[PDB]
């Protein structure tokens, strides 16, 4: 799960049913209920990629954009999340359009639930069955990655260890 060459987008994430400190330095290694001094004295694998601004959105019970539309943790949680840098692996010149996210949806999701659909969103009164012009937009939008981006826009590969 950690050394996979291909990582899926956040809207359609992978679900997969030792020592973890032999990797790169970690931007966000925090845990809830259990501590890293208690995990070694102690399972699902859900992984996706998140831009550097909203890495803090992956948290139990807080609102936002990716934490309300794509993947969000319930208020009660015992597992935790590991975030780590990926700039020379998944960012390259010209952009990386493999990593999508969903922006528009009818309502927020149930916990631990994913949605893969390209039904065109409706934001008005006239029913747009298949026309994504004005007042009707495509759900999935892509956010590329270039080496000219700053410290808050790198694609951070991330994974949660649900217990």
């Amino acid at each position: 799960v950690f050394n996979a060459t291909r990582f899926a987008s956040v809207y359609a994430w992978n679900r997969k049913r030792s020592v973890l400190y032999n990797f790169a330095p970690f931007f966000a290694f925090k845990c809830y209920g259990v501590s890293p001094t208690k995990l070694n004295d102690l399972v699902y694998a859900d992984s996706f990629v998140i831009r550097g601004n909203e890495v803090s959105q992956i948290a139990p019970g807080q609102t936002g954009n990716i934490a309300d539309y794509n993947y969000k943790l319930p208020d009660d949680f015992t597992g935790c999340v590991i975030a780590w840098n990926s700039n020379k692996l998944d960012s390259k010149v010209g952009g990386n359009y493999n990593y999508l996210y969903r922006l528009f949806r009818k309502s927020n999701l149930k916990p631990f639930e994913r949605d893969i659909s390209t039904e065109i969103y409706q934001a008005g009164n006239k029913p747009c069955n298949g026309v994504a012009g004005f007042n009707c937009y495509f759900p999935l939008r892509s956010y590329g990655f270039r080496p000219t981006y700053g410290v808050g826009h790198q694609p951070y590969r991330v994974v949660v260890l649900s217990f």
């Epitope: 359009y97 493999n98 026309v131």
Partner: antibody
Framework: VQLVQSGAEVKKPGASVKVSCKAS????????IHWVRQAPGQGLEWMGW????????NYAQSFQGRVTMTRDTSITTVYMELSSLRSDDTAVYFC????????????????????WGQGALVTVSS | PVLTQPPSASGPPGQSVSISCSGS????????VYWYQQLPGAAPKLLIY???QRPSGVPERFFGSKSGTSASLAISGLRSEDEVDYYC???????????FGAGTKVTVL
């Protein structure tokens, strides 16, 4: 960015074609290489793309089991194999670089062919 | 499920000419459409992308827009360069492959 294709040769039907193009002056691993054919008389037609960091060769539904596309990453080339070419396949062939890079299927909304190499046509008849 | 468009459009110099392009459910109106200009006997290049955007070096007189399941391209100023073939290019999800137009010929009067 510069893309150079090979020349045009005589191919009797039932034989294979040696069509290829190279990448120069830019990083070859971060850009897809789509292929576009064009018969003289009508519009363009799509073939498939190469992801030059793995082995992912997607094709169209019409020519799914007909074409053979192969990466040779050593000398930054992209090779292509068509065996038993037929009379309707007489066309000029382009390889094109798309901006960005994706290997999925629901990622082609932001893919347009930026730069194009010069074409190389193929022949028919015994 | 292929894009359809008039094979040729002719206009006098002095006003613009409009090129229309209509598509199916999975060609236009669910995905972006691009316009490609082909020099005669050479490699075609991008002229319109992202439905209102242009690369640098393209003169600010080429106009394109879409309203429903069809798209329109307008070229203002026709003296010595725009007498070439134009192509309506868009992504298709039904065929899961890139699809193109038949080819529009522009002739001045």
């Amino acid at each position: 960015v510069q893309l150079v294709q090979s020349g045009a040769e005589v191919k009797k039907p039932g034989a294979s074609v040696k069509v290829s193009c190279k990448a120069s002056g830019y990083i070859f691993s971060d850009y897809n290489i789509h292929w576009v054919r064009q018969a003289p008389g009508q519009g363009l037609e799509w073939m498939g793309w190469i992801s030059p960091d793995s082995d992912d060769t997607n094709y169209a539904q019409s020519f799914q089991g007909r074409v053979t596309m192969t990466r040779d990453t050593s000398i930054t080339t992209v090779y292509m194999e068509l065996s038993s070419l037929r009379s309707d396949d007489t066309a000029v062939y382009f390889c094109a670089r798309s901006v960005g890079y994706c290997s999925l299927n629901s990622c082609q909304r932001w893919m347009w062919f930026d730069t194009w190499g010069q074409g190389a046509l193929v022949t028919v008849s015994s | 499920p292929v894009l359809t468009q008039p094979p040729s459009a002719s206009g006098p110099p002095g006003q613009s000419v409009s090129i229309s392009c209509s598509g199916s459910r999975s060609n236009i109106g669910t995905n972006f459409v691009y316009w490609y200009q082909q020099l005669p006997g050479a490699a075609p290049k991008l002229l319109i992308y992202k439905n209102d955007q242009r690369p640098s070096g393209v003169p600010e007189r080429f106009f394109g827009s879409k309203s429903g399941t069809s798209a329109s391209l307008a070229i203002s100023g026709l003296r010595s360069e725009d007498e070439v073939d134009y192509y309506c290019a868009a992504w298709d999800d039904s065929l899961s492959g890139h699809v193109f137009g038949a080819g529009t010929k522009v002739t001045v009067l």
